[PDB]
């Protein structure tokens, strides 16, 4: 039958990288950048 099941309509997006939250995606990704490395790898694994 129909399909209706969710958790909430607020900060539904949760960063699987650290565990943060965000109302939308843009607001989330913009933060996920901290987990995104660049060509020039730093002292950390990445
Ligand atoms: Zn995060």
From Swiss-Prot:
Disulfide bonds: none
Domain of life: Eukaryota
Subcellular location(s) per record: Nucleus
Zinc finger (C2H2-type): 13-35
Job description of the protein: May be involved in transcriptional regulation.
Protein family membership: Belongs to the krueppel C2H2-type zinc-finger protein family.
Protein name (Swiss-Prot/TrEMBL): Zinc finger protein 347
The organism of origin for this protein: Homo sapiens (Human)
Residues of the full protein shown: 284 to 316 of 839
């Amino acid at each position: 039958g129909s399909s209706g099941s969710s958790g909430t309509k607020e900060k539904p997006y949760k960063c699987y990288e650290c565990g943060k939250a965000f109302r939308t995606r843009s607001n989330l990704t913009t933060h996920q950048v901290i987990h995104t490395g660049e060509k020039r790898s730093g002292p950390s694994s990445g």
